[PDB]
Design an enzyme around this catalytic site. Structure first.
Site, mmCIF file in Angstrom:
data_model
loop_
_atom_site.group_PDB
_atom_site.id
_atom_site.type_symbol
_atom_site.label_atom_id
_atom_site.label_comp_id
_atom_site.label_asym_id
_atom_site.label_seq_id
_atom_site.Cartn_x
_atom_site.Cartn_y
_atom_site.Cartn_z
ATOM 1 N N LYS A 64 -6.098 1.306 19.616
ATOM 2 C CA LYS A 64 -6.263 1.444 18.702
ATOM 3 C C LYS A 64 -7.923 1.360 18.471
ATOM 4 O O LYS A 64 -7.860 2.755 17.486
ATOM 5 C CB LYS A 64 -4.782 1.561 18.333
ATOM 6 C CG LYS A 64 -3.914 2.755 17.958
ATOM 7 C CD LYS A 64 -2.129 3.047 17.810
ATOM 8 C CE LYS A 64 -1.658 2.928 19.594
ATOM 9 N NZ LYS A 64 -0.743 1.679 19.866
ATOM 10 N N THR A 93 10.540 10.643 -0.282
ATOM 11 C CA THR A 93 11.032 8.671 -1.530
ATOM 12 C C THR A 93 10.612 8.492 -2.224
ATOM 13 O O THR A 93 10.519 8.180 -2.868
ATOM 14 C CB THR A 93 10.042 8.429 -0.081
ATOM 15 O OG1 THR A 93 10.571 8.130 0.907
ATOM 16 C CG2 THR A 93 9.065 7.373 -0.669
ATOM 17 N N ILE A 98 15.937 7.537 -3.959
ATOM 18 C CA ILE A 98 15.739 7.879 -2.834
ATOM 19 C C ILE A 98 14.816 7.469 -1.568
ATOM 20 O O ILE A 98 14.101 6.467 -2.038
ATOM 21 C CB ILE A 98 14.762 9.670 -2.097
ATOM 22 C CG1 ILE A 98 15.878 10.417 -3.319
ATOM 23 C CG2 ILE A 98 14.966 10.430 -1.055
ATOM 24 C CD1 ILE A 98 15.534 12.090 -2.968
ATOM 25 N N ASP A 182 6.141 0.622 -16.112
ATOM 26 C CA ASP A 182 7.775 0.505 -16.349
ATOM 27 C C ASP A 182 7.948 -0.716 -17.798
ATOM 28 O O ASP A 182 7.777 -1.722 -17.725
ATOM 29 C CB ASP A 182 8.551 0.330 -15.443
ATOM 30 C CG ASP A 182 7.749 -0.989 -14.277
ATOM 31 O OD1 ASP A 182 7.465 -2.220 -14.776
ATOM 32 O OD2 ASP A 182 7.988 -0.572 -12.920
ATOM 33 N N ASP A 248 14.331 -2.144 -17.302
ATOM 34 C CA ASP A 248 14.988 -2.950 -16.790
ATOM 35 C C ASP A 248 14.575 -3.728 -17.837
ATOM 36 O O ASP A 248 13.879 -4.676 -18.376
ATOM 37 C CB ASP A 248 14.650 -3.410 -15.815
ATOM 38 C CG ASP A 248 14.478 -2.886 -14.510
ATOM 39 O OD1 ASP A 248 14.285 -1.191 -14.556
ATOM 40 O OD2 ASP A 248 13.796 -3.220 -13.398
HETATM 41 NA NA NA Z 1 12.635 6.505 -3.868
#
Ligand code: NA
Ligand code: NA
Length: 327
Positions: A64, A93, A98, A182, A248
């Site tokens: 590669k 994703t 997910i 977040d 959170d």
């Molecule tokens: Na996700």
DNA sequence: CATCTG
DNA sequence: CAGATG
């Protein structure tokens, strides 16, 4: 750091694919060390033969490197880039909850888009459902100016609930950063520690408050010491409502605060360096504690810390304001 | 790691 | 319980 970048970079897409599309944890795990070693590598790899030399660097990789070295491209890479299938995974994703595993199934059922999902909300779970419902917002970076507002809220209600609470909002936010991803809050209480057998209300009570007053809008997962959620800055005088935020909250035994507090605060680079130094200074540190390291090989016994200052002290270091905690 | 699903 | 997600 720039001498062998594309190489480390191709390796990285390669690896990522393996684990995201294919299931090749094996291979995947491989590209990684690979990228890792060439990375420290101090010279301009002119050929595959040159890399192979390296450990981790097998015949295929060299295969590669040579090609990509030879042509500013990779066929495999390029073929991988088009492939709608690989695309859908890598995409869906992006929804909270997910993962890849689910990425596959959905695609495999032909869900491959935002709309797909909405159309089939049924096949999604509460988390995945919220994940999708705040798709955009969740993708949106958090401006400090909002962060301070939120913090003001969190702290005021926690205070209200018990003058004894100790919240800390960690992360880059803490490190100063202009924006954030977040809201991360570190939670403890006197009445909660190491031996101290539980008290789940410790975490619940607050969750409720933040929810009373509408700060927190949804639950991702509320456990007995970790709540994963969604909060929102009240829309003032209607015209400009805020985005929905990923917050959170986590309970911690008082006897363990500053260790984490240090830790969560980063940066990762700071942690290591600080971690390595500890080690020199005759100690060990990790997320919960700092212990007197014996000679025999190892040894423990959690030293007692009353602030981020006690820790630094221990390893005989310069107390660093969260700001310079960069590296 | 701790929570969740099924 | 295994297995996933964050
Ligand atoms: Na996700
Ligand atoms: Na090798």
């Amino acid at each position: 750091e720039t001498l062998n970048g594309g190489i480390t970079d191709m390796l990285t897409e390669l690896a990522n694919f393996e684990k995201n599309v294919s299931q090749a944890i094996h291979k995947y795990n491989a590209y990684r060390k690979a990228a890792s070693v060439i990375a420290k590598y101090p010279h301009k790899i002119k050929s595959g033969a040159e890399a192979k030399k390296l450990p981790g660097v097998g015949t295929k990789i060299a295969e590669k490197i040579d090609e990509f070295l030879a042509t500013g491209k990779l066929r495999k890479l390029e073929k991988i880039r088009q492939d709608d299938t690989s695309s859908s995974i890598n995409f869906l994703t992006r929804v909270s909850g997910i993962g890849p595993s689910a990425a596959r199934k959905f695609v495999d059922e032909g869900i491959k888009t935002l709309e797909d999902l909405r159309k089939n909300e049924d096949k999604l779970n509460h988390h995945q459902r919220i994940g999708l419902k705040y798709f955009g917002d969740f993708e949106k970076r958090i401006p400090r100016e909002e962060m301070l507002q939120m913090q003001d809220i969190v702290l005021n209600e926690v205070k209200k609930v018990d003058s004894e609470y100790i919240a800390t909002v960690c992360g880059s936010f803490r490190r100063g950063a202009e924006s954030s991803g977040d809201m991360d809050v570190l939670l403890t209480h006197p009445s909660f520690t190491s031996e101290s057998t539980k008290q789940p209300k410790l975490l619940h009570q607050v969750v409720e408050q933040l929810q009373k007053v509408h700060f927190i809008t949804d639950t991702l997962s509320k456990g007995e010491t970790k709540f994963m959620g969604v909060c929102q800055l009240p829309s003032k005088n209607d015209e400009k409502e805020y985005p929905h935020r990923r917050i959170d909250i986590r309970l911690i035994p008082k006897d363990q605060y500053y260790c984490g507090v240090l830790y969560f605060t980063g940066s990762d680079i700071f942690n290591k360096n600080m971690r390595a130094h500890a080690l020199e200074k005759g100690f060990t540190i990790n997320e919960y504690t700092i212990r007197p390291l014996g000679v025999t090989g190892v040894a423990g016994e959690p030293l007692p810390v009353d602030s981020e200052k006690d820790i630094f002290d221990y390893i005989q270091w310069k107390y660093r304001e969260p700001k310079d905690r960069s590296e």
